[PDB]
Design an enzyme around this catalytic site. Structure first.
Site, PDB file in Angstrom:
ATOM      1  N   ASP A 221      -7.858  -6.107   0.038  1.00  0.00           N
ATOM      2  CA  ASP A 221      -8.556  -6.702  -1.099  1.00  0.00           C
ATOM      3  C   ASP A 221      -8.145  -8.150  -1.337  1.00  0.00           C
ATOM      4  O   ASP A 221      -8.969  -8.960  -1.779  1.00  0.00           O
ATOM      5  CB  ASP A 221      -8.312  -5.868  -2.359  1.00  0.00           C
ATOM      6  CG  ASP A 221      -6.838  -5.653  -2.640  1.00  0.00           C
ATOM      7  OD1 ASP A 221      -6.151  -6.626  -3.014  1.00  0.00           O
ATOM      8  OD2 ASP A 221      -6.367  -4.507  -2.488  1.00  0.00           O
TER       9      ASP A 221
ATOM     10  N   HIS B 288       0.832  -1.195   0.000  1.00  0.00           N
ATOM     11  CA  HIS B 288       0.000   0.000   0.000  1.00  0.00           C
ATOM     12  C   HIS B 288       0.872   1.252   0.000  1.00  0.00           C
ATOM     13  O   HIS B 288       1.969   1.273   0.564  1.00  0.00           O
ATOM     14  CB  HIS B 288      -0.930   0.004   1.214  1.00  0.00           C
ATOM     15  CG  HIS B 288      -1.978   1.072   1.169  1.00  0.00           C
ATOM     16  ND1 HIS B 288      -2.554   1.599   2.306  1.00  0.00           N
ATOM     17  CD2 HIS B 288      -2.561   1.706   0.124  1.00  0.00           C
ATOM     18  CE1 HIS B 288      -3.442   2.514   1.963  1.00  0.00           C
ATOM     19  NE2 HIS B 288      -3.466   2.599   0.645  1.00  0.00           N
TER      20      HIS B 288
END
Lengths: 371, 365, 370, 129
Positions: free
Chosen positions: B304, B253
């Site tokens: 996700d 991320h």
């Protein structure tokens, strides 16, 4: 450190479409004077200039006009969907919903920069005209393939073929509102297009943003104020009441232009010509009376009538319903939005602003048995 | 500190909804820890906290639930309109069209703060499930008045009553995504709501701009997990993707690098769901291999990577991974609209011209 | 990057002199229950406890009381200065001006044991004399010399009214002052503390505090005015209709942070009813009781209770005090807390200097004549 | 009853409800109109109200129905004409409820009495011709 409250002065992007400077009263599309351009040009040429940045040739203009004419027919599914639409709603919301639905039928390489723009520029006028016809219960009218663009729009709206002079005036009015500086609608379109999804979602979001607060428009409230004035004799009391309350009288005084913006004067001249060639009516008389009674004293503080004040009268005399003012502005606005989207497609960088948190810290949840 | 391409790092508004901390990897809703809130709270309570800013009492929550259950019905006109939609469309475009059409029936405009939010929070799942059924081909199914919100959504989607454990897992997975820091979609929604038009337009704009390129990460991560082959094929394709100078999706991320709590909590719920109820073994094998073989670049599986698995197990179509995220995010969108309704800032950024001046229009070119 | 609006919820200082509960309705001075102190403790004992933190001894208490009595005499120059004051000036502005002017006559700024005690005792002693003198001057009456025989509240009442009051009224006034002695940090206390941070002198600090204490247009007096406007109970229903329609918190009812039946309210109403049964009941007090009952019978479910300001205004009106003098009474009651905060801040030295957020244009050009 | 309940549901944009072959007549009508199963006591009260409202003497609507039926065409046209002529001007009991709501509490009784005295007209909802 530094924090501007509402992005009031921060530069958004390296704009290269238009430029406006209130000091010299200049408004240029691709660095071309608005009055000189609109003197001897049509709406299609202006749109091509806004989209591609260079004036086209006669053959290319003819091909573009042929493609525009070929893509005026509306799919019957959308007509059925509008038959399933309600009636008490406002036309702008239905237009936004139809623009959002447009993406379903058309989706999914070099050709997908030219078909989308022409389809979106062609279908929207026929779409809003069809919804206007449906709202009153009348059936939609199939467009003709011989009339001009403004002539076709007038035929769709009022089922009466207008004079060529009226069509030229309507085309000039459309290209007058063709594109303006960056504002709420344009910035919303830009931020939506920053993710390079499709022109349809961008135009849907931009139309949704363009919807005036409390479901109203500047032209609508200007007409309401004119009606609330009443007869010609009552011009002075309302004007002095508006001046006394220290509230900006609607239709008088802009925010950026104080040097007699060319759009206002050119639209006023066009309105003069249109009202003089056709029936005068009391509308123009009362408008002249009130505008003179205001400007005879408002000129001290640099307050002048704006574009919408004349545009409302022009639209009213042209035979257009009041509630349809917003879509007519939206036609030129989507014309500009397609140019902003085309400009934005080059650089791929989404807007990712941060924030300063102004809340509590390190609390805890409380079960229902205590609170 | 005036111009910076991309408009990155420039503060926008005095937000008081979500908080972030890269060095510590914390996340709070109105200053309440995400893990603790998800442990012992429902989705409706979280939505109430995000919108009104204060936790609700017993009577307030009961009234909110009663209104939600009463207004969850869908007018048949919407169903008739959605009957006409083409079968080749995409679920998110249909969702945007439906959310735009909802404005016609509820134009209206002191009480115009609570009816709109409850109607818009109730009707969206019913509409998206109805369009999923219509695209499949079958007729819609009327909602029940006994099932829970997640249970009702599952029953509408897969026409089967889910177990209470599955309903709880879906509720917590939904409330995990209920809010995040300001991003493209949230900023676009804030800009749209700055003009204070109506909720039905800002939500439509937000769901329109939420669509990623090519029309999230769930579909691509599921495709890569399916295409990896068998267990013995984890190394070849992974090293091929490493060598081709392509960033590995589902990892790394941009902001969080300390194992953000959302990822670990979703992994834990996935683990506790899988055992009681193929994908599981291969997914854990590939994630373990990647974690053990990188070990230096701060590579961590984000939310996700496991959200796709937890959705796939629960019986959701692959394309439908985006509308559920939209349903989760609509609560935050409404909260931001409510917060921005008071400001009345009217955003208006001024550009800078970089062209020419005083040209001429030639009649012939 | 954090930025609270209005500087709310920021630990400005590590104060240990006062405490509030917020949930159980507890109020503590140096960690002592408010009711326990209000039961059988005089105002001077409470002031000494606030200033020093330890309960005084008998000899120390007697010495402090004698020192207070000895310094009740005001310089004649102060009276001559107040003579030139106009008769239209509101009392609190004149009180602030006199407090600021007091600094001229006392400029020690250096023995060290003397400049921790003499300044505070003089500031605590001379304020009632000054305010009473200005009250007399505003009506064109010659100021009255203080007496060295009566009690503190008794002396103040005698100076204000020239009529010797009953000891019961003096005790009621003293306990009202001691329950009004100090509260938590607010705007006035924050201003006093930030001024005292640079450890200049107590006189400037108290002058700034009393200056910033005055609200817009200079609540309890407004409550009394509204009560007089309502009149008899025949006009109750328009008040209820107005309160329902306005959808705003009615002034004089409820507290911003206290919705748990604040302890001071019940004590103050008990004192008021005691005073009214001792000295007979007047019709307007019964009107106040009727209107407060008719309010509480409907506003109880919303958590709205009568505030201490209403009862304080009622008891002050019943005691024979002008309405315009309500603010100076609050100031003289509060003057202990400001001194306590100055004393506790004097131990450390941390000058307040926060930063700012710039929300203006960054660079422009100077037009010569254009 | 099915037709009127279906139109009542449609007017609010709700899907019509299929009738049930188990409840009673008034019970079935109430269920179709409201979707909520009522108590048998309420069903009996509604049934007896209907049966006391079943028929009256000859009036305008009955006369129109009879004159239409005189030519013995069909019952459907007769009932259509009767229900068409039944609707009064601007489409009494509802007006009575509206007036009752307008009056509100008993604090406004005296203006009603003053109005009824001054108008010198028969107050609607009270008395029969």
């Amino acid at each position: 450190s530094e924090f501007r409250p509402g992005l009031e002065g921060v530069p958004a992007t390296l704009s290269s479409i238009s430029f406006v400077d209130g000091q010299r009263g200049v408004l240029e599309y691709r660095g071309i004077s608005i009055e000189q351009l609109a003197q001897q040009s049509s709406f299609l040429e202006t749109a091509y200039l806004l989209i591609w940045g260079h004036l086209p040739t006669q053959q290319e203009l003819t091909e573009f006009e042929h493609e525009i004419r070929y893509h005026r027919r509306i799919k019957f599914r959308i007509r059925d969907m509008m038959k399933c639409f309600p009636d008490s709603g406002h036309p702008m919301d239905a237009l936004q919903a139809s623009a959002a639905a447009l993406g379903l039928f058309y989706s999914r390489d070099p050709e997908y920069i030219r078909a989308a723009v022409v389809r979106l520029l062609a279908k929207i006028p026929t779409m809003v005209a069809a919804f206007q016809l449906i709202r009153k219960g009348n059936d939609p009218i199939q467009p003709r393939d011989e009339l001009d663009y403004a002539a076709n729009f007038l035929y769709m709206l009022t089922e009466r073929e207008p004079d060529p002079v009226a069509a030229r005036i309507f085309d000039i009015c459309l290209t007058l509102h063709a594109e303006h500086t960056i504002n709420a609608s344009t910035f919303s379109a830009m931020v939506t297009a920053s993710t390079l999804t499709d022109p349809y979602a961008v135009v849907a979001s931009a139309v949704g943003t363009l919807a005036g607060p409390l479901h109203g428009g500047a032209n609508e409230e200007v007409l309401d104020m004119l009606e609330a004035i009443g007869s010609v004799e009552n011009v002075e009391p309302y004007l002095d009441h508006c001046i006394a309350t220290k509230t900006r009288i609607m239709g008088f005084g802009h925010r950026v232009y104080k040097v007699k913006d060319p759009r206002a004067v050119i639209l006023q001249n066009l309105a003069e010509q249109l009202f003089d060639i056709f029936g005068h009516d009391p509308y123009y008389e009362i408008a002249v009376a009130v505008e003179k009674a205001a400007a005879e004293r408002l000129s001290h503080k640099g307050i002048y009538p704006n574009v919408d004040f004349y545009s409302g009268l022009v639209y009213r005399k042209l035979g257009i319903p009041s509630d349809l003012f917003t879509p007519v502005f939206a036609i030129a606005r989507v014309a500009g939005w397609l140019a902003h989207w085309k400009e934005q497609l080059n650089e791929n960088r989404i807007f990712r602003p941060t924030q300063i948190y102004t809340g509590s810290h390190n609390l805890d949840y409380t079960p229902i048995a205590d609170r």
